[PDB]
Amino acid sequence: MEYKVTPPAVLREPLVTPNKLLMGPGPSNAPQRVLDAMSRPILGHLHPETLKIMDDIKEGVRYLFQTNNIATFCLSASGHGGMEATLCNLLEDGDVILIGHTGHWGDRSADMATRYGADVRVVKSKVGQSLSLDEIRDALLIHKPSVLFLTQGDSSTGVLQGLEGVGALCHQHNCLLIVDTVASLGGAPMFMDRWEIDAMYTGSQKVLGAPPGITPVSFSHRAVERYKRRNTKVKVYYWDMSLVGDYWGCFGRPRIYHHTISSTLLYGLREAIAMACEEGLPALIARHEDCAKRLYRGLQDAGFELYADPKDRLSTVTTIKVPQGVDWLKAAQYAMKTYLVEISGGLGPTAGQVFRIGLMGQNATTERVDRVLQVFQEAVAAVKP
Amino acid sequence: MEYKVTPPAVLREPLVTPNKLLMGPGPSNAPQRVLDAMSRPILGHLHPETLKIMDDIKEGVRYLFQTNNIATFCLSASGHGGMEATLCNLLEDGDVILIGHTGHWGDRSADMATRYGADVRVVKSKVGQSLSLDEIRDALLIHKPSVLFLTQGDSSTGVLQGLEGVGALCHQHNCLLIVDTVASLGGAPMFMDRWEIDAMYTGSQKVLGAPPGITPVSFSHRAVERYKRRNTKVKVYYWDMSLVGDYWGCFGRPRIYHHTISSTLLYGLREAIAMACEEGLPALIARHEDCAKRLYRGLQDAGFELYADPKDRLSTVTTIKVPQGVDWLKAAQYAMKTYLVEISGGLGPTAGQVFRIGLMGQNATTERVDRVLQVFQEAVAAVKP
């Protein structure tokens, strides 16, 4: 019996995972409590104890999102999967969607919407700015979409998009409002129901500090009604709102087999969410806002120039212009080799033009602000002509 | 300023995760080494230490699969994600796909294929049997598909589908062969390249005993060529072979950002794959076959009746007919309440018809076989007249 491929020598070496200060825009450092929880034994996907953990997670995301939506659950996918499922469920071929573009995430949602067969329209912000309510209204009137997509915290540009009045306006025009809060939840106000948002998701690895790979989502009654009026099945079984909602106990129905949830990731997320709910939103958001303000002061004292408009800044991700003369990638490598601290470059329209420093979860403390300020400064000084 | 939803009391309680013997068809009990590795700190999704782990995983999957395919990687999704991606990438609207149905997985693959816009044909095995080559050949001739989908180990019926000569036959007729090995890999022979299989995936949580949620996949040169002649983009960015392949270092292009992989699931999977590679395929699969043989002798001696034809049995999942007068659910509950041991009912077409005992990874040992034999018999005797 002949085996042309042999057992890899590489796998006889130990697994190596250096412990780093992750001060890029994500993932953030997991609290030790969430790491310890991910050593717990595996559970069956339909076991009562798993379902209880899932039930507890739902309450926690409703608190974090500030929603009472019955269709609140998590997707067994990284944060992109929230963008996929939201678009996949709420679009049919030819539907017109308006993308509010405030950075990379406008490009990515436009791409997915087009892959799903929608008629994609885009309104773009001014550079380093959010979209105004006027700009949103004007584009809505022009395009008459059935879905408007906005990113609350665009992590490529470090920009926080204001949301008040936008859901109400959409609903004057038979439009659903989808909002990405992956980078913004916990670091800026969010009230899903109050702001009349129809679909929303965040990530597990940003402010929460859970492992990447499971993503909380919620759909309003209006979004559920849209799903119910579809003429065809959603294109992906794996994302189908009704089926994963049933698995997560949301609607009238028996819990059945949809897929095997990762109980490991459930454990870390549940613990991450319990930590956040224990701090509470007012203190959690104020802590990130206050660390950002400390960072701005340190950066601006040192002669650095910030990318985003001062009125439009996202506390969790700070974009900073790469100074004339500096190789951003060399600066990044210097900080990592010398200190095991991560500083990042840009994303999409800001690739090569900015650094991005994340202040998220475990990392949004005055001590870690000071540490990243110190090492960012040295790394740039070390590579500058 | 007003929080209508209050921090949940439920999340103030300890997280509880009982340590059970998972002798259902998955997940299986994780080795302590995999649980330990999942407390390791998170890493950046594009850090060299993360890419190294991915590179090492690729080598281990090529070993396990027996393939040299360059397009080998893992999807950030549970096992259904392998089915989704394999179908998403290799099908365009109207493509004829033939599903070889040997149980539930035939229904699920037909469902996804139809959702993706394909023209779906089905050829169904005899009850509790695999498809014969002649049955496959006849169906190929009737339908002239461009893809054939088989499930090597159908865990709903406990049936192992024979694959020798089928990829060769498909290729004589201008057809790709996709194979699900989620339940069979490590428990039955598999030689991806030797058997001329064009796309294949397995699960992390079955024989491997990693956490659920990341799924090894591979695509042959012919599959890659099919992808390249598409005239439409694949519907889901999250599953796009060429983009996840680039993130995984497969095609000679720069690694870029596609999505944040889960560090935690990489660590558990890496370690589970290293362990399986250490044991080696000959010994791994013989161990699962020998344990199944012991289980069969124990079951039949006790007067139980096996569901799958004796020539078509899958070692890792044994379907046993529910005896007349036994409430299978009640029996399952008795075993869990008294011993914290999981035994399962059926799935799709075998629902209400069978118990399923999984012998996978850590649980394919003579000791655990003896344990499940003992608890199963006791559970059944407890609820029977």
Hey, CA dihedral for A226, A228, A233, A238, is it positive or negative? positive
Residues of chain B contacting A28 with CB distance shorter than 8 Å: 42
Method: X-ray
Distances (CA, A) of B143 to A104, B94, B102, B104, B134: 44, 13, 18, 21, 14
Which of B15, B111, B213 is nearest residue A37 as measured by Cβ atoms?
B15
CB A18 within 8 A of CB B42: no
How many Å apart are CA B245 and CA B258, to the nearest integer?
A: 10
**Quick one: tokens of B288?**
């699962």
> What is the enclosing helix (H) or strand (E) of B135?
helix B133-143
Residues B93 and B118: their CA atoms lie apart, in Å, by: 5
Best CA proximity match to A184, nearest among A289, A101, A96: A289
Whether the CB-CB separation of A219 and A242 falls below 8 Å is answered with no
Amino acid code (one letter) for B374: Q
B188–chain A nearest CA distance, Å: 14
In chain A, what residues touch B180 (CB-CB under 8 Å)?
none
CB atoms A3 and B281 under 8 Å: yes
Q: Do B23 and A85 form a contact (C-beta atoms < 8 A)?
A: no
The reply to whether omega before A27 is within 30° of 0 (cis) is: yes
Q: What is the dihedral of CA A77, A158, A292, A179, to 10 degrees?
A: -50
Q: How much is the CA Rg of chain B, to the nearest whole Å?
A: 21
A173 by Cβ neighbours in 10 Å (0-12 / 13-18 / 19+) ranks as middle
Distances (CA, A) of A242 to A250, B96, B108, B351: 9, 28, 16, 22
- Cα A307 off chain centre by: 20
| In the block, residue with structure tokens 């071929």 | A93
Strand B21-22, strand B341-342: pairing: parallel
Q: Show the DSSP H helices in chain A as ranges.
A: 32-37, 48-65, 79-90, 104-115, 133-143, 166-171, 221-228, 241-247, 263-279, 281-301, 328-339, 366-383
Nearest in space to B76 (alpha carbons), one of B186, B204, B192? B204
Task: List phi, psi (to 5°) of B170.
Answer: -55, -50
Residues in A touching B67 (Cβ below 8 Å): 5
Which long-range contacts does B51-54 make (Cβ < 8 Å, 24+ apart)? Answer: B51/B249, B51/B255, B52/A16, B53/A15, B53/B266, B53/B267, B53/B270, B54/B248, B54/B249, B54/B261, B54/B266
Sort A12 into a burial class: Cβ within 10 Å, 0-12 / 13-18 / 19+: exposed
Distance CA B175, CA B195 (A): 14
Phi, psi of B100 (to 5 degrees): -85, 105
What is d(CA B72, CA B83) in angstroms, rounded to the nearest whole number? 15
Our measurement of the distance from residue B257's CA atom to the centroid of its chain's CA atoms, rounded to an integer in Å, reads: 27
- CA proximity to A377, closest of A362, A355, A360: A355
Q: Which residues pair with B355 in a beta bridge?
A: B320
Domains of chain B from N-terminus onward: 1-30+280-385 (3.90.1150.10), 31-279 (3.40.640.10)
Instruction: Count CA within 13 A, CB hemisphere, residue B385.
Output: 4
Cα–Cα distance between A282 and A290 in angstroms, integer? 12
- Closest-CA distance of chain B to residue A248, Å: 16
Q: Are B9 and B188 in contact (CB under 8 A)?
A: no
Query: Token pair 């209050």 is at which residue?
Result: B6
For residue B321, the surrounding DSSP H or E stretch is strand B317-321
Distance CA A352, CA A349 (A): 9
Q: Is the dihedral of CA A256, A176, A200, A57 positive or negative?
A: negative
Contact B80 A43 (CB under 8 A): no
Distances (CA, A) of A369 to A51, A310, A314, A339: 39, 19, 15, 15
Among B3, B4, B5, most A C-beta atoms within 10 A, so best to mutate, is B5
Q: Of B366, B352, B347, B375, nearest to B182 (Cα)?
A: B347
Please report the DSSP string for A186-230 in residue order: TTB---TTTTT-SEEE--SSSSS-PPSS-EEEEE-HHHHHHHHT-
Partner-chain contact B237 A273, CB within 8 Å: no
Tokens encoding B88: 């998403």
Distance from C-alpha of B311 to C-alpha of A40, rounded to nearest angstrom: 39
Q: How far apart are CA A154 and CA A346, in angstroms?
A: 12
Judging by DSSP bridges, how do beta strands B199-201 and B215-219 pair with one another?
antiparallel
Amino acid at residue number A229 = R
3-state secondary structure of A165: coil
Taking an 8 Å cut-off on Cβ atoms, the answer to whether A4 and B203 are in contact is no
Quote the CA–CA distance of A264 and B166 in Å, as a whole number.
38
How far away is chain A from the Cα of B3, in angstroms, using its nearest Cα? 7
- Does B79 count as an annotated binding residue? yes
Going by the DSSP 8-state scheme, the letter that residue B132 receives in this structure is: P
* Residues B359 and B315: beta-carbon distance below 8 Å: yes
Give the chain A residue nearest B11 (alpha carbons): A274
Answer yes or no: do B26 and A260 touch at CB < 8 A: yes
Backbone angles phi, psi at A41, to 5 degrees: -60, 150
* Contact by Cβ (8 Å): B40, B50: no
Q: Is B346 annotated as a binding residue?
A: no
Three-state SS at A341: strand
List, in sequence order, every residue forming a beta bridge with A97; answer none if it has no partner.
Answer: A120, A147
